[PDB]
Amino acid sequence: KHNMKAFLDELKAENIKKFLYNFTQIPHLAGTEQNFQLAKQIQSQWKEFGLDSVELAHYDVLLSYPNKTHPNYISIINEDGNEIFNTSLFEPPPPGYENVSDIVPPFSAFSPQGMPEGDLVYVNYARTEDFFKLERDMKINCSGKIVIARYGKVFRGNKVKNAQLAGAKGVILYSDPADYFAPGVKSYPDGWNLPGGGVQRGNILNLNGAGDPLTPGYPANEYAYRRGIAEAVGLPSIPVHPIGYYDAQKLLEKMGGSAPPDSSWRGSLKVPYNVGPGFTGNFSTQKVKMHIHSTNEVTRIYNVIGTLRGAVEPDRYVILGGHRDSWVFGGIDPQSGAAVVHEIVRSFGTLKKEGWRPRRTILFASWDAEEFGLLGSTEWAEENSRLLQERGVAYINADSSIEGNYTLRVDCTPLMYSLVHNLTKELKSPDEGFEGKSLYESWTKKSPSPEFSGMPRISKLGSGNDFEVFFQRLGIASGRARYTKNWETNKFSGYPLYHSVYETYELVEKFYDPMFKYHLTVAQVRGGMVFELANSIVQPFDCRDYAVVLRKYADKIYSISMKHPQEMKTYSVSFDSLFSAVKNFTEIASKFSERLQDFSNPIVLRMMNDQLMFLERAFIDPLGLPDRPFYRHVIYAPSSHNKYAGESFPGIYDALFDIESKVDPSKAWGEVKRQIYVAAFTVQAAAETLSEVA
């Protein structure tokens, strides 16, 4: 029998291991020949595995690379202009890789060129609240200073935006052991911690969903008209470069000026964490100088797109997508995910060869240039937006399958909560101590829901990965799942070796998942979700779960506003319309659910399946959010302060943020009221899509 169990049983830990090894022997940086060859390999293999068609979709997009013969570095310079200390030109390569070529040295992708020289100011994590503290409380001015910020807490592009707005003339990012070195674990190669020479690569754009900087709204195809660089979207205006903690300690140790305001500003290095500006007296005439010579260049990228045509509803698409490009070897990011996709395709193809097809079409994607701003997924979705918005059922992401070995992590639309609970109750837990128990049982025990007893935590989607175009631009129900660390006992951010040369096959095989049991579990979750979405007669979405969360988010945004009771009185700021809409949505969803359970008629079914499919679509506002036209979902957007985090009722949230500091309160509260009206209207309009249709 060809059912979910058949699909799941065909998945093998040993195959995922073999694929991971295969994908991580050489670097696969976007835009390079090595990553085009891997695209061709995956295309060939997916054909072999049994997909109906497998094509490459290419685009020519703006990418950024260091200059191989003019390396980036930072100096401390003396009064004479002698560079008395220089940061490293590369990370010491790991054992057995010291002869691998084409390892890109650490750099911040899309940095402009420059050689700014100046006094340092230390800005903690460079968050909005860190700059508030510096400017408003400490009265420190960053204008014309080079800022040094520790990585962690928020997306690095928000740090750079924050520093630019503070007037910085350059930014130095570094990895503090406080945030990237777990106590009691050894540095790579002897454990999974970041060594002092390790450095985190990553782009520093602020694209807000636009995709390729030069072609917002349209695919970067063969005839595309491109903006000039000066009009490009999202590029930083000041040079930026990342360093490791051995080099950071040399830059921080001499810092003078003001003491850190409190302990939350102190990392773990043996330095005072003085804010500056500049160095202590004896070194007061020394300065820091950056030398950045990277160049931005339009470069071809390649997505692999595989199709498994549906037997009954070929014009409904369930998409499983993850990226293939990596900063270096991509041992965790992305190849731990790409190897799981590859095994999922193999398992679906095995059923296909035996005569099976899914009810709906499944599309499988190997995206390129994710690391440079979600470029491959976004350009493809721009090209195919009409097809996706009328036919797209769901998008399941597949980046890193592991960032720890403790329990499951799922982020998704509320429409998928019930599907995830049900699927995980049918899967076996891979956890020690949970032998013979369900994944739901282990997950719920280790990661309990904050709101509900006996249920596991499922988070909102943020951004910083390839589901962004599908969810926040196009309104297609989306989700992601991976294995993660224990958030209670672990204070570090992400995993320590993120975007470093040390993210290798050996890191995974030795330290994260030697048996590949957590990878297999993630393959079952991602693959199972795709299976259900593509095969279920009635789409496995529960609109009632959206109703529950909408009330939670309404309560939350009301609570923020109610910190300003005088202003709500003065400007007659009422949330009554939003609560009304949420009440209506709850009532209508309940009635729709009754009809759905209680309706042979394939028209009523598909009519009902379309109401389910277009429900996420109904939260899209075609005018977008203020100054962010590609974030169009009214319930969820990436936080304006941290792209990785999701924010609920973002238009109202950003209207309320720091409102007590606005110079014209009447105008500011007017915009809060406008955003309440937009959100209440959008929730009522989404509810009405679930009413009887005539």
Ligand X SMILES: O=C(O)CC[C@H](NC(=O)N[C@@H](CCCCn1cc(COCCOCCOCCOCCOCCOCCOCCOCCNc2ccc([N+](=O)O)cc2[N+](=O)O)nn1)C(=O)O)C(=O)O
Ligand Y SMILES: *[C@@H]1O[C@H](CO)[C@@H](O[C@@H]2O[C@H](CO)[C@@H](O[C@@H]3O[C@H](CO)[C@@H](O)[C@H](O[C@H]4O[C@H](CO)[C@@H](O)[C@H](O)[C@@H]4O)[C@@H]3O)[C@H](O)[C@H]2NC(C)=O)[C@H](O)[C@H]1NC(C)=O
Ligand Z SMILES: *[C@@H]1O[C@H](CO)[C@@H](O)[C@H](O)[C@H]1NC(C)=O
Ligand U SMILES: *[C@@H]1O[C@H](CO)[C@@H](O[C@@H]2O[C@H](CO)[C@@H](O)[C@H](O)[C@H]2NC(C)=O)[C@H](O)[C@H]1NC(C)=O
- The torsion angle over the Cα atoms of residues 573, 579, 585 and 588, rounded to 10 degrees, is -120
CB atoms within 10 A of CB 674: 14
Could you tell me the smallest distance in angstroms from the CB atom of residue 151 to ligand X?
Answer: 7
658 binds ligand U (CB under 6 A): no
DSSP code for 258: B
Contact characters 416-455, ligand X, x per CB under 6 A: -------------------------------x--------
480 binds Cl ion (CB under 5 A): yes
User: How far apart (Å, rounded) are the C-alpha atoms in residues 229 and 19?
Assistant: 39
User: How far apart (Å, rounded) are the C-alpha atoms in residues 486 and 446?
Assistant: 8
Could you tell me the smallest distance in angstroms from the CB atom of residue 380 to ligand Y?
Answer: 14
Contact characters 504-523, ligand Z, x per CB under 6 A: -------xx-----------
User: How far apart (Å, rounded) are the C-alpha atoms in residues 611 and 413?
Assistant: 16
Is the distance from CB of 412 to CB of 461 less than 8 angstroms?
A: yes
| Nearest Cα residue to 258 out of 132, 129, 163, 140 | 140
In this structure, what token pair is assigned to residue 378? 């976004």
> Which range touches ligand X (CB under 6 A), out of 311-319, 388-396, 458-466, 516-524?
458-466
Contact characters 209-238, Ca ion, x per CB under 5 A: --xx--x----x------------------
Distance of CA 196 to the CA centre of its chain: 26
Is the distance from CB of 116 to CB of 211 less than 8 angstroms?
A: no
User: How far apart (Å, rounded) are the C-alpha atoms in residues 345 and 339?
Assistant: 10
Could you tell me the smallest distance in angstroms from the CB atom of residue 85 to ligand U?
Answer: 6
Give the DSSP H or E segment for 478.
Answer: strand 477-484
User: How far apart (Å, rounded) are the C-alpha atoms in residues 550 and 633?
Assistant: 13
Residues forming the site for ligand Y (CB under 6 A): 222, 577, 580-581, 584, 680, 684
Distance of CA 106 to the CA centre of its chain: 20
357 is in an annotated binding site: no
492 binds ligand Z (CB under 6 A): no
Residue 44 partner contact from Ca ion, Zn ion, ligand U, none using kind-dependent CB cut-offs of 5 to 8 Å: ligand U
438 binds ligand U (CB under 6 A): no
668 binds its own copies (CB under 8 A): no
* Measured CA distances, 476 to 247, 341, 361, 377, 655 (Å): 44, 20, 15, 14, 26
489 binds ligand X (CB under 6 A): no
> Which range touches ligand Z (CB under 6 A), out of 56-64, 138-146, 221-229, 629-637?
138-146
484 binds ligand X (CB under 6 A): yes
Residues marked active site are found at 370, 574, 610, 633
Could you tell me the smallest distance in angstroms from the CB atom of residue 126 to ligand X?
Answer: 12
81 is in an annotated binding site: no
* Interface with Zn ion in residues 395-414 (CB under 5 A): 399
* Interface with its own copies in residues 215-274 (CB under 8 A): 217-219, 221, 223-225
User: How far apart (Å, rounded) are the C-alpha atoms in residues 531 and 3?
Assistant: 9
Q: Give me the half-sphere count of Cα atoms (radius 13 Å) on the Cβ side of residue 218.
A: 9
User: What is the DSSP track for 273-293?
Assistant: ---BSSB-GGGTT-EEEEEB-
User: How far apart (Å, rounded) are the C-alpha atoms in residues 305 and 43?
Assistant: 8
Could you tell me the smallest distance in angstroms from the CB atom of residue 205 to ligand X?
Answer: 6
Amino acid identity, position 12: K
110 binds ligand Z (CB under 6 A): no
466 binds Cl ion (CB under 5 A): no
644 is in an annotated binding site: yes
Is the distance from CB of 359 to CB of 537 less than 8 angstroms?
A: yes
In this structure, what token pair is assigned to residue 314? 């070929």
The only residue of 371, 506, 542, 545 in contact with ligand U, by rule CB under 6 A: 542
The only residue of 540, 624, 638, 651 in contact with ligand U, by rule CB under 6 A: 540
Residue 638 partner contact from its own copies, Ca ion, ligand Z, none using kind-dependent CB cut-offs of 5 to 8 Å: none
User: How far apart (Å, rounded) are the C-alpha atoms in residues 226 and 61?
Assistant: 10
DSSP code for 11: -
In sequence order, the 6+-apart residues with CB closer than 8 A to the CB of 467 are 321, 395, 397, 461, 478, 479, 480
User: How far apart (Å, rounded) are the C-alpha atoms in residues 83 and 96?
Assistant: 33
SS3 of the chain: helix, strand, coil, percent, to 5: 40, 20, 40
Residue 34 partner contact from Cl ion, its own copies, ligand Z, none using kind-dependent CB cut-offs of 5 to 8 Å: none
What counts of helices (H) and strands (E) characterise the chain?
Answer: 21, 19
User: How far apart (Å, rounded) are the C-alpha atoms in residues 461 and 409?
Assistant: 11
The only residue of 25, 44, 82, 141 in contact with ligand Z, by rule CB under 6 A: 141
Residue 397 partner contact from ligand Y, Zn ion, Cl ion, none using kind-dependent CB cut-offs of 5 to 8 Å: Cl ion
203 is in an annotated binding site: yes
Only one residue has tokens 């259900």, namely 532
Could you tell me the smallest distance in angstroms from the CB atom of residue 105 to Zn ion?
Answer: 17
431 is in an annotated binding site: no
Residue 314 partner contact from ligand X, Cl ion, its own copies, none using kind-dependent CB cut-offs of 5 to 8 Å: its own copies
Site size toward ligand Z (CB under 6 A) is 13
Q: Which is nearer to ligand Y, 13 or 573 (CB)?
A: 573
Contact characters 380-419, Cl ion, x per CB under 5 A: -----------------x-x--------------------
Contact characters 576-615, its own copies, x per CB under 8 A: xx------------------------xx--xx--xx--x-
Site size toward its own copies (CB under 8 A) is 53
In this structure, what token pair is assigned to residue 619? 């939260």
* Measured CA distances, 686 to 475, 543, 546, 594, 683 (Å): 12, 10, 11, 18, 5
In sequence order, the 6+-apart residues with CB closer than 8 A to the CB of 694 are none
324 is in an annotated binding site: no
52 is in an annotated binding site: no
DSSP code for 135: I
Q: Is 245 helix (H, G, I), strand (E, B) or coil?
A: helix
Contacts with ligand Z by CB under 6 A lie at 67, 69-70, 141, 143-144, 192, 295, 404-405, 485, 511-512
- Can you give the binding site for Cl ion, defined by CB under 5 A? 397, 399, 480
Residues annotated as binding site for Ca(2+)?
A: 215, 218, 379, 382
Binding residues for Ca ion (CB under 5 A): 211-212, 215, 220, 382
Binding-site annotation: residue ranges for Zn(2+): 323, 333, 371, 399, 499
User: Under the rule (CB under 6 A), what is the footprint of ligand U?
Assistant: 22, 25, 41, 44-45, 75, 83-86, 418-419, 422, 540, 542, 597
Task: Show binding-site residues.
Answer: 156, 203, 215, 218, 323, 333, 370-371, 379, 382, 399, 463-465, 480-482, 498-499, 643-644
Residues that bind Zn ion (CB under 5 A): 333-334, 399
Binding site for ligand X (CB under 6 A): 152-154, 202-203, 333, 370-371, 373-374, 399-400, 409, 411, 447, 457, 459-462, 464-465, 484, 487-488, 493-494, 642-646
